[PDB]
Ligand binder design. Structure first.
Ligand code: PRP
Ligand code: PRP
Ligand code: 7HP
Ligand code: 7HP
Ligand code: MG
Ligand code: MG
Ligand code: MG
Ligand code: MG
Lengths: 187, 194
């Protein structure tokens, strides 16, 4: 890992935290009557970064018998400096309607929260039975709009992280661990 | 699993098989000199089903120093049913151009091959440096159109399988193992639906 200046979390540490978060989520919905087909917990995976976190999380939720429905969404920037609001173009939205369902947006990392805040509100306006967010990493001090994730795997400082779905110029997403991109590489 | 007739592959087995296939992919591409930033192997993950296989395969590829760049597309054909609609719908195509790059389509299962045939004929025209496919499961005797994947983790019978990303009406994709869905379970759902 010559391109990394430090290891944040190993695959093992990540695996354990997700399991804890999943047990937590499971307990939290224990009284919502989740059932496959008719009342599953809808996971809205925001591409591309959360693809790895989502794969491991849904399996951990499966361990606690929480029936889920996987949705993947693809968003795009409108252009540079065209929005304050965090508005994004929807290239791929949910396949089914979330109206009346329990929904959980899955993200890899939240910092400014501009896009996640915009997405939260958009889905909120579609009337799901409930709406919450689970983010793997949270750069709490990087906010540009106020926003709180309901479930978070780890809070971290303002370092550029890569690995476990997280990229730098679309490189390193495949690492099993989360590491800090060393400055000399970004330079 | 009450809804399962039987387990085809456990998580451990799938894991074991994915490692061996990743090792082969590494050996086979060694001569291409794949490098991060300038020459990664482009992985085209076919959503939704391929999401899990893709997450575990890219890590296994990482173990063998194969640098990759992920592209996520979305294609639909079965919908809420058990059989091919006979039509393949492109919901989301690649963000970047595949022209001049080494591309590996990553799929969860191939049966009639209408999906992969559709994809190959679309991507081949874009002139990638090379185009290959890795499918987790292959129902070899279910073809409507011919198709031979470059890498196959396992050959299976024509029965409906779920788990490890594979669904029946967008249900069961989260299972850690791959299992055979009982016809009584899908039949009751089919009836409730139609
Ligand atoms: O709260 P923010 O300041 O927006 O930071 C976090 C977002 O940015 C990254 O996505 P990106 O735009 O990189 O797309 P990607 O997931 O496909 O890499 C990351 O994947 C989060 O979605
Ligand atoms: O060889 P074929 O008969 O074309 O069948 C295989 C395709 O059907 C399934 O996808 P589906 O259309 O169900 O979409 P999904 O991946 O979102 O579940 C499977 O994931 C393959 O993509
Ligand atoms: O450190 C970080 N690593 C990867 N993506 C993002 C987005 N915000 N901050 C990031
Ligand atoms: O067995 C099977 N399970 C899920 N999807 C498909 C498509 N073709 N065959 C399938
Ligand atoms: Mg993202
Ligand atoms: Mg990114
Ligand atoms: Mg598919
Ligand atoms: Mg399907």
């Amino acid at each position: 890992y010559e391109f990394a200046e430090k290891i944040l979390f190993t695959e093992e540490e990540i695996r354990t935290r997700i399991k804890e978060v999943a047990k937590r989520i499971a307990d939290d919905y224990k009284g919502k009557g989740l059932r496959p087909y008719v009342n599953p917990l809808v996971l809205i995976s925001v591409l591309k970064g959360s693809f790895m976190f989502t794969a491991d999380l849904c399996r951990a939720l499966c361990d606690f018998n929480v029936p889920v429905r996987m949705e993947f969404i693809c968003v795009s920037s409108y252009g540079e400096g065209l929005t304050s609001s965090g508005q994004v173009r929807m290239l791929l939205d949910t396949r089914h309607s979330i109206e009346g369902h329990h929904v959980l947006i899955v993200e890899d990392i939240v910092e400014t929260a501009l896009t996640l805040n915009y997405l939260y509100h958009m889905y909120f306006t579609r009337r799901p039975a409930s709406l919450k967010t689970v983010v793997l990493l949270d750069k709490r001090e990087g906010r540009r709009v106020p926003f709180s994730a309901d479930y978070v795997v780890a809070n971290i400082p303002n370092a550029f992280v890569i690995g476990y779905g997280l990229d730098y110029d679309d490189t390193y997403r495949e690492l099993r661990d989360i590491v800090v991109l060393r400055p000399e590489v970004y330079a």
